[PDB]
């Protein structure tokens, strides 16, 4: 019970990591300071600046769903 409870703790903390990080960087980050000008959901910002796949807040949600499914699993 101890072990699996700490697995659950891991799940909650990680899922909230994805979601919170996605929420706070939704307006912008150093990689994309004007992200708010593109909206909640967009493909990316392009291969430039190193590459910007899954950079939107929507994508953060999308990633977080896997961790929720894992946690509830």
């Amino acid at each position: 019970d101890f072990l699996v409870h700490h697995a659950i703790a891991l799940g909650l903390h990680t899922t909230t990591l994805i979601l919170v990080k996605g929420a706070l960087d939704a307006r912008g980050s150093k990689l994309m300071p004007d992200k708010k000008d593109f909206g909640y959901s967009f493909p990316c910002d392009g291969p430039g600046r190193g590459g910007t796949c899954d950079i939107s807040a929507w994508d953060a949600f999308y990633l977080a769903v896997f961790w929720m499914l894992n946690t509830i699993g």
Partner: protein, 141 residues
């Protein structure tokens, strides 16, 4: 300055491929690129395969503008040869496209009026809430 005229000049030597025009050329639009080659020579087709450009005037019809600028870029870069291209509609109308004012867009040229130029740094764009329920975007200001 008046744009270039578009006559019926011979097309490059090619056995034909499956990468050429489709119905889009018939119903929507296709494109035409012309160039003047110093000699007969081999060039790679944007639509795949190898063709031979003839000496003198050459006219090639392509399906996309990107194919035209691609081929033209390869011409100017590899074969040191000037090119032009136009857009063509099914009714017969021809629209001169590139180079627009006779000068390559890489180098400055007087006469061109600015389009979509915001006289402010990118960080000074207003938040989306400032444009809520309007038809405007923060970058359209």
């Amino acid at each position: 300055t008046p744009p270039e005229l578009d006559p019926n000049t011979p097309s490059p030597i090619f056995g034909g491929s499956t990468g050429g025009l489709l119905r889009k050329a018939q119903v929507e639009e296709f494109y035409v690129i012309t160039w003047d080659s110093p000699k007969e020579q081999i060039f790679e087709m944007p639509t795949g395969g190898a063709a031979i450009m003839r000496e003198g005037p050459n006219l090639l019809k392509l399906a996309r503008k990107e194919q035209c600028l691609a081929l033209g870029t390869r011409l100017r870069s590899k074969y040191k040869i000037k090119y032009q291209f136009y857009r063509v509609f099914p009714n017969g109308e021809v629209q001169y496209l590139h180079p627009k004012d006779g000068v390559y867009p890489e180098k400055v040229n007087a006469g061109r009026q600015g389009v979509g130029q915001n006289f402010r740094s990118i960080g000074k764009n207003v938040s989306p809430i400032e444009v809520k329920f309007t038809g405007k975007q923060p970058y359209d200001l």
